[PDB]
């Protein structure tokens, strides 16, 4: 029975959104203005004589700013269709999206859901313009751009909603009827979720002429509702949506509940004293039926949001029905409070009742009742004391569940009444469909920050669409994030387009630093679990303790020797890959550089952790027992083509690695390494002698061959589960051929890393390379077109750096899921363009 | 859950009503024609080039005849408002009334009922015309004449319906959505009864331009639905209503059940391949949801009324969804039958689904499935055999409950599906709002008669409004009534206006005839009961038997003597008044003439039946024992003014009665009576010697005074419950002063009947005088302005005459209730006038 209002959006004459609407209401603000000069001239259609042909007694109204502006690209609408599209449809689209975002629901998540759309709409001023344009102005978009049911259906189409979708027209009750219909759709279980709302736009003078000939318009332009100056109403344009759910479903889904629709009723005036004369007894009947369905009694209903238009005929009849249904029955002298948002915003016509509903929701959320603005003397036609009714003349803090009624009456006598009871390091991730929209969405989130930083992060990560233009602000707490949203050039930014496949890169040398993973052992439970598993795997060989070396315990080795630094780097890389996969980034392939291949071979599933640990530990020990202190290595910023030439005259040298088409690595005898380095420094080139006492990938490695085959003989390699691009074979590895001989060849022969990345990038569609390392050493070597993503950096190796790397990956359109790292924040910054006939 | 369809009405291109619609369907008739020349020129807007500006590829459509004609007076609409009124509203009014009459419900009985109105409407061509007219054409009726919700609300207003009232727009599913909404309103108990329907009218070319630019229109003008020639649809205009009730309520109310809505569902296409592209999987989802709510399985659904438009994109998707939801699941080789009424009538747009629903109702009522007309070769895009679907190419008698589906899809992707199971002397009284309408309604009932005569009478008496122009045909049986509906100048006719108050007239002499009430003793149980009660009252005085005298038994008196004829006339008049009151005609007053006063005094409650019987019997016996054979009476067609003068020279005469201002009655000595009669015959006047051996109201009556006071002394008169106008005192009797002296004065003094009727007519507002008598003798004497109503006539005194008198009374707007005297008969003959902008 009870229906949660879980989200709201509105667009009303003085207010872009429900906070702005509440600010206007609490302030007692009046948004009735002159007619906009940009649509249609106020005075040219004005005449004080009600009988004057084709002219209105009213110069004033509630108007929405920028009804002609729409973000057609956001909804995938061509400018020609948007031009043909009724502004009511455009506004219902943007309102529907905003209202769902206000519920904290990503609207793109609703595709295929049984979500109903129930919209009230009754005016057709854009159709009036299309008609005035006459023949030949009709195009293939005219019919769908003007048909009013498309207001609901287009919203169902764009969001992919499969539930019922229809527009109701019962006049100025239509929105509240739509809410009633949505509520019954929820009670049947026909819908799991519903967008109930309505829209009206005063796009042409014809509607203010027809309303002035019908007669209801205030010659003063303000609705003195229930006041002795009740000279008529003023037209208003607006729209609103509520997102509605069963209260059980909303609480179970943890959705915010703004208010509960306890009950509602719809009836008609029937044989009133003329069709457009309101009927007090039919209004009583709606009040009573709705409150009965609400299971509610008068003493519980503290306020009614009037239909209250300030017409001299309508107000006494509404007051009489309220006193007969609610005022009497409440204790005498604690009256029912009443007011009308039409005293603030005018008569939003078809949207009128949703406006009253949203006002009431804001009143319960605010625990206060807004004033009615055009009220000095109680209308003498109304016996307010004898009804036990009081017009709420002042903002009243609302000190028993708070309960309000909302009434909406149509000119056709369709009455609706609804009873609302009151409700029973971190990333902020911002995304939009364009750079200008992204910048706007950042500026709005900064203004919002200008609060639970984590709850905001949950709403931004789970409750918002993930579009292609992405920024992330990463901060320790609310003000840290707020400051970092200033100077927004500092944010992580990126564009999620070409992603295709991801490769995990496992580097070799130069990635170590004292204390790598020490802060991460405390920060990340997955990393600590993986490092404990790696320590268990390594312990039958290393004699020391992995965690002791990482935490730099006093009695631990200090990463100075190879037989320590290589298994520690192996463990860190295995664990960091485990962390990446924990956060949604599984590798489509893995590629390793030198010893990194061992780590690759484990994350590919090729080698087992026992065997991977044995390989890394025993190869490192052989290096320390025979290769250490005997060789040297040298990085040169120069292509391997000229480098293989410069190796002439140095039989004790070789090319160790070709990391990119700009910088190679030679390895061999230390004296010849120094000779080549000095020769390069003679021609003015870049040369970086690598701090390594051994000479990997050289000839000297052959010395340890008779040792390696003795200690790696028992290996049992398996078929790689993840593809494994060997930079030794220079190609895919699809067979269990990673035995000890392979691990000797890897250490003895060149590293073909640039061939590997050129192959994976040009051929197999790999767009992102995630360097799973303690410090990036290879990402400055991939081709300019592939994305490179590091993990940890030197001395930046804690949770700060982990979330920075995950943010740079997810901004790169990677499958980052923010849940393992994790409230009225802004809705989408629509980049609205003018579209018109 | 199950909803009875209890009534239907439709107005479709070739058919005024559901019988005409079924005749078209069974005949395989096609009502698609050229565009009407009277609205807008076909060719001026035609161009074979779809791209041609402001022109349509289609010259053809389904059109309603006389969309501009409306019986505005019947609905109380001024010609100016009717002129402003959208023809869709006018047609929904007439359809709503007809549909309720088809249920056999008097629509005026529905005032204040929780009856919902649910209408689908989507086009606004009359608004298009009003808009084209520009400024200053807008009037106080433009807004209500154009607003689409008023289509529902106006019907709720005129019929006084208090239930919900709204128009739904979901495009070309809207009508069926309206039915779905009405069904859920019935299941909630929000409505006890609902009018669900829809309307669309092609009032302007703009809609056929916009539909040809959207592209769906058949360049051939015919919808080859599911056929290889599927070149598009053709537009159609129409309307339909179903009256819906809970099946339990309909069976309990004894309402006719035409079909049962077992279940329905509404969904949207959601993110279809474009908003206006149909989605086969969403259509499957509606089919499955609706059939689940129907508790139904494929083998039960024998036919589906397609949405089937003959567009080449729509038909394969609909066929695919049907085969996936119904065709497979039925046994292979006994396929699901399909067809489309759009092959007969084109696409009735917003009314489309109600048309399909009414067709299906007519199919279940008819136990046959109509053909689809534009179908020679199965569309090769559809794998009909692999779907197990067959297009019903021929009229198929439908030999397990019969079950059909109806599908309606909107261009906005709102899909609706509904499952219909098959259903689980006498007066004919004709009334209309005008003489021309009455004559038309008689001609229609004669054509209908051209059948259970009693069931027809029940439907005409209980199931039709009682308007002011009234006829009654009275006959022994169906053909007798049918013949008597020929030469309809013979009917009882009358006008129900001035009625004010009714007086029961109880006459004195000249009303007797041998055998009065003998046929009525057998025919009327109330009359026989009353006559038995009167016989019980009379028996302690009369020595004879009342029933024996009435049945003219052999040993009974033959009404020749006064002491018999007066108590028998008393009994007959008392009993006939009882009969009148049994049939709804209670007297506002009673007035008696001579001995008739005794009867009056009983029906007024003044005297009791024992005392009334004693008075009549003993006065009659005194008359026979002393007044009989001694006096004489004479009726003269002449005013009492000259008659009191002509009584000069005749001391043995007097004026006995002044019955009207034209004919008096003298009474006295027989010789002087004959002398006066001869004198009147000498001056050429009218003179009727009354066959009465006594001389009432004369001087001779004084002789019996000493007797009367001896036999009437014990009387206990009471206060008159019904007013009692004495024609002896010449005024009201409001005190218990009807003792024996009064009954002597009544017999001894004049009868002031003309004074009585002038007083009751001029003063107290009495308009109808019901002569409760065995033969009228006073009705030819009332003023020309009051209505006179007799009861029985001489030798016409059986049930024939009783129903003739009740018919003449009820045609005179008397409270006649036909129940104690008591099926697809015609609906109201609307006298439709052209109304337009």
H-helix or E-strand spanning residue A349? none
Integer Cα distance of B604 and B601 in angstroms: 5
Tell the residue number behind the tokens 């169906």, with chain if given. B478
Give, in order, the Cα–Cα distances in Å from B559 to each of B516, B530, B567, B830: 11, 20, 10, 54
Q: Would you identify the CATH topology of the domain A501-820?
A: Malonyl-Coenzyme A Acyl Carrier Protein; domain 2 (3.40.366)
CB A173 within 8 A of CB A353: yes
Integer Cα distance of B343 and B308 in angstroms: 8
Burial of A112 (0-12, 13-18, 19+ CB in 10 A): middle
- CA dihedral of residues A378, A380, A386, A388 (deg, nearest 10): -20
Integer Cα distance of A327 and A319 in angstroms: 9
Integer Cα distance of A17 and A34 in angstroms: 22
Q: Could you tell me which residues come within 8 angstroms of residue A148 by beta carbon, excluding any fewer than 6 positions away?
A: A86, A88, A121, A124, A167, A169, B122, B148, B169
Asked if the C-beta of B266 comes within 8 angstroms of chain A's C-beta atoms, the answer is yes
CB A478 within 8 A of CB A514: no
**A442: which 2 tokens?**
């950042």
Asked if the C-beta of A278 comes within 8 angstroms of chain B's C-beta atoms, the answer is no
SS3 A263: strand
**B255: which 2 tokens?**
């309402």
Contacts from A550-556 at CB under 8 Å and sequence distance 24+? A550/A515, A550/A516, A550/A517, A550/A518, A550/A521, A551/A518, A551/A521, A552/A514, A552/A515, A552/A518
**A239: which 2 tokens?**
């729209």
CB B167 within 8 A of CB B147: no
Listing DSSP states for A271-327 in one string gives S-SSTTS--HHHHHHHHHHHHHHTT--GGGEEEEE------TTHHHHHHHHHIIIII
**A500: which 2 tokens?**
């295709």
H-helix or E-strand spanning residue B61? strand B60-62
Partners of B426 in beta bridges = B475
CB neighbour burial string for A575-589, b if at least 16 within 10 angstroms, e if fewer: bbbbbbbbbbbebbb
Write the residue in B138, B140, B209 that is nearest to A135 by C-beta: B209
Give the catalytic positions of B in this structure.
594
The neighbour count for residue A794, using CB atoms within 10 Å, is 15
Query: Given 3.40.47.10, 3.80.10.10, 2.60.120.10, 3.30.70.580, which CATH number is that of A3-422?
Result: 3.40.47.10
CB–CB of A269 and B157 under 8 A? yes
CB B668 within 8 A of CB B650: yes
Name which of A57, A138, A293 to mutate to probe chain B: the one with the most chain B Cβ atoms within 10 A of its Cβ: A138
Contacts of A168 in chain B (CB under 8 A): 166-169
**A565: which 2 tokens?**
């630094």
The neighbour count for residue B586, using CB atoms within 10 Å, is 14
SS3 B280: helix
Is the sign of the CA dihedral B716, B718, B722, B725 positive or negative? positive
Write the residue in B156, B169, B214 that is nearest to A143 by C-beta: B214
Q: Could you tell me which residues come within 8 angstroms of residue A464 by beta carbon, excluding any fewer than 6 positions away?
A: A101, A106, A429, A431
* Nearest CA-CA partner of B236 in B217, B219, B215: B217
H-helix or E-strand spanning residue A228? none
Contacts of B411 in chain A (CB under 8 A): 143-144, 147, 150
CB–CB of A122 and B411 under 8 A? no
Write the residue in A111, A138, A162 that is nearest to B210 by C-beta: A138
The neighbour count for residue A430, using CB atoms within 10 Å, is 29
Is the sign of the CA dihedral A346, A352, A355, A360 positive or negative? positive
Is the sign of the CA dihedral B174, B178, B183, B185 positive or negative? positive
SS3 A115: strand
Partners of B260 in beta bridges = B4, B421
CB neighbour burial string for B812-826, b if at least 16 within 10 angstroms, e if fewer: bbbebebeebbeebb
Asked if the C-beta of B690 comes within 8 angstroms of chain A's C-beta atoms, the answer is no
CB–CB of B214 and A272 under 8 A? no
Give, in order, the Cα–Cα distances in Å from A505 to each of A657, B4, B460, B791: 15, 71, 91, 114
Integer Cα distance of B95 and B101 in angstroms: 10
Domain boundaries, chain A: 3-422, 426-500+821-821, 501-820
Q: Where are the alpha helices (DSSP H) in A160-256?
A: 174-188, 205-214, 247-252
**B596: which 2 tokens?**
């008739």
Beta-carbon pairs below 8 A across chains A and B: 266
Asked if the C-beta of B153 comes within 8 angstroms of chain A's C-beta atoms, the answer is yes
Give ∠ CA A74-A77-A80 in degrees, rounded to 5.
Answer: 135
| Minimum CA–CA partner of A126 in chain B | B131
CATH 3.30.70.3290 fits A426-500+821-821, yes or no: yes
| Minimum CA–CA partner of A216 in chain B | B140
**Residue A555 φ/ψ, nearest 5 degrees:** -85, 25
Asked if the C-beta of A268 comes within 8 angstroms of chain B's C-beta atoms, the answer is yes
| Minimum CA–CA partner of B128 in chain A | A131
Burial of B397 (0-12, 13-18, 19+ CB in 10 A): exposed
* Nearest CA-CA partner of A116 in A47, A195, A44: A195
What share of residues in chain B are helix, strand, coil (percent, to 5)?
Answer: 40, 20, 40
Q: What is the DSSP letter of B826?
A: P
* Nearest CA-CA partner of B92 in B236, B204, B207, B200: B200
Q: Could you tell me which residues come within 8 angstroms of residue A426 by beta carbon, excluding any fewer than 6 positions away?
A: A453, A454, A457, A474, A475, A476, A477, A481, A803, A821, A822
**B314: which 2 tokens?**
């729509």
SS3 A197: strand
Name which of A132, A170, A321 to mutate to probe chain B: the one with the most chain B Cβ atoms within 10 A of its Cβ: A170
**A319: which 2 tokens?**
């007051």
CB A582 within 8 A of CB A693: no
CB–CB of A414 and B177 under 8 A? no
Burial of B486 (0-12, 13-18, 19+ CB in 10 A): exposed
Give the catalytic positions of A in this structure.
594
Experimental method: cryo-EM
Write the residue in B209, B272, B275 that is nearest to A144 by C-beta: B275
CB B30 within 8 A of CB B282: no
Integer Cα distance of B308 and B823 in angstroms: 33
**Residue A8 φ/ψ, nearest 5 degrees:** -140, 150
Distance from the B115 Cα atom to the nearest Cα atom in chain A, whole angstroms: 9
Name which of B92, B150, B204 to mutate to probe chain A: the one with the most chain A Cβ atoms within 10 A of its Cβ: B150
Name which of A96, A164, A175 to mutate to probe chain B: the one with the most chain B Cβ atoms within 10 A of its Cβ: A164
**A75: which 2 tokens?**
């909804």
The residues in A 195-254 lying below 8 A from B, measured between CB atoms, are 205-206, 209-211, 213-215
Give, in order, the Cα–Cα distances in Å from A49 to each of A213, A223, A317, B787: 11, 19, 27, 53
Asked if the C-beta of B54 comes within 8 angstroms of chain A's C-beta atoms, the answer is yes
């Amino acid at each position: 029975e009870p229906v949660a209002v879980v989200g709201i959006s509105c667009r009303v004459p003085g207010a872009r959104d429900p906070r702005e609407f509440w600010e206007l209401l609490a302030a007692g603000g009046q948004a009735v203005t002159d007619v906009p000069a940009d649509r249609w001239n106020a005075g040219d259609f004005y005449d004080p004589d009600r009988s004057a042909p084709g002219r209105s007694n009213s110069r004033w109204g509630g108007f929405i700013e920028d009804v002609d502006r729409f973000d057609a690209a956001f909804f995938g609408i061509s400018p020609r269709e948007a031009a043909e599209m009724d502004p009511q449809q455009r506004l219902a689209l943007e309102l529907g999206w905003e209202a769902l975002e206000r519920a904290g629901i990503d609207p793109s998540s609703l595709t295929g859901t049984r979500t109903g759309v129930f919209a009230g709409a009754i005016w057709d001023d854009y159709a009036t313009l299309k008609h005035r344009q006459g023949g030949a102005a009709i195009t293939p978009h005219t019919v769908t751009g003007l048909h009013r049911g498309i207001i609901a259906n287009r919203l169902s189409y764009t969001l992919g909603l499969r539930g019922p979708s229809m527009v109701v027209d019962s006049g100025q009750s239509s929105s509240l009827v739509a809410v009633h219909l949505a509520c019954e759709s929820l009670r049947r279980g026909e819908s799991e979720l519903a967008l109930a709302g309505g829209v009206s736009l005063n796009l042409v003078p014809d509607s203010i002429i027809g309303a002035s000939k019908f007669g209801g318009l205030s010659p003063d332009g303000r609705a003195y509702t229930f006041d002795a100056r009740a000279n008529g109403y003023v037209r208003g344009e607006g729209g609103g949506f509520v997102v509605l759910k069963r209260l059980s479903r909303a609480v179970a889904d943890g959705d915010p509940v703004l208010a509960v629709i306890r009950g509602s009723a719809v009836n008609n005036g029937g044989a009133a004293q003329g069709m457009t004369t309101p009927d007090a007894q039919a209004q009583e009947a709606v009040l009573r039926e709705a409150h009965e369905r609400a299971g509610t009694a008068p003493a519980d209903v503290r306020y009614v949001e009037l239909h209250g238009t300030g017409t001299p005929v309508g107000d006494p009849i509404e007051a009489a029905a309220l006193g007969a249904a609610l005022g009497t029955g409440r204790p005498a002298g604690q009256p029912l409070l009443v007011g009308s948002v039409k005293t603030n915003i005018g008569h939003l016509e078809g949207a009128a009742g949703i406006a009253g509903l949203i006002k009431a929701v804001l009143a319960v959320r605010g625990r206060a009742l807004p004033a009615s603005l055009n009220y000095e003397t109680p209308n003498p036609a109304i016996p307010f004391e004898e009804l036990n009714l009081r017009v709420n003349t002042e903002y009243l803090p609302w000190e028993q569940r708070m309960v309000v009624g909302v009434s909406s009456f149509g000119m056709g006598g369709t009455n609706a009444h609804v009873v609302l009871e009151e409700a029973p390091v971190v990333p902020w991730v911002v995304s939009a469909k364009s750079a200008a929209a992204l910048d706007a969405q950042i500026e709005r989130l900064a203004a919002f920050a200008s609060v639970d930083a984590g709850a905001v992060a949950r709403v931004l990560a789970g409750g918002r669409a993930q579009f292609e233009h992405r920024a992330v602000v990463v901060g320790s707490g609310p003000d840290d994030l707020a400051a970092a949203l200033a100077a927004p050039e500092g944010l992580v930014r990126g564009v999620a387009s070409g992603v295709g496949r991801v490769a995990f890169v496992f580097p070799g040398q130069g990635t170590q630093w004292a204390g790598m993973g020490a802060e991460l052992l405390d920060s990340s439970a997955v990393f600590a679990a993986a490092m404990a598993e790696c320590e268990a795997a390594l312990s039958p060989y290393v004699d020391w303790s992995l965690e002791a070396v990482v935490r730099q315990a006093p009695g631990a080795p200090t990463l100075e020797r190879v037989d320590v630094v290589q298994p520690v780097t192996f463990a860190v890389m295995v664990s960091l890959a485990r962390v990446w996969q924990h956060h949604g980034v599984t590798p489509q392939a893995v590629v390793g550089h030198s010893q990194g291949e061992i780590a690759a071979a484990y994350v590919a599933g090729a080698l087992s952790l026992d065997d991977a640990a044995r390989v890394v530990t025993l190869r490192s020990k052989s290096i320390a027992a025979h290769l250490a202190g005997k060789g040297g290595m040298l990085s040169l910023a120069l292509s391997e083509d000229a480098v293989l030439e410069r190796l002439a005259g140095f039989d004790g040298l070789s090319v160790a690695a070709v990391n990119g088409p700009t910088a190679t690595v030679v390895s061999g005898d230390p004296v010849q390494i120094e000779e080549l380095a000095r020769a390069c420094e003679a021609d003015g080139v870049r040369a970086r002698v690598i701090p390594v006492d051994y000479a990997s990938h050289s000839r000297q490695v052959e010395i340890i061959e008779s040792e390696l085959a003795e200690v790696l003989a028992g290996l049992s390699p398996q078929a790689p589960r993840v593809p494994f691009f060997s930079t030794l074979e220079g190609a895919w590895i699809t067979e269990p051929v990673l035995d000890g001989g392979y691990w000797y060849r890897n250490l003895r022969h060149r590293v073909g890393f640039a061939p590997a990345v050129e192959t994976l990038a040009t051929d197999e569609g790999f767009t992102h390379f995630v360097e799973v390392s303690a410090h990036p050493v290879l990402t400055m070597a991939l081709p300019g077109t592939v994305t490179g993503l590091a993990t940890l950096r030197r001395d930046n190796g804690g949770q700060d750096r982990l979330v920075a790397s995950l943010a740079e990956a997810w901004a790169n359109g990677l499958a980052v899921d923010w849940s393992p790292l994790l409230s009225d924040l802004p809705t989408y910054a629509f980049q609205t363009e003018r579209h018109w006939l």
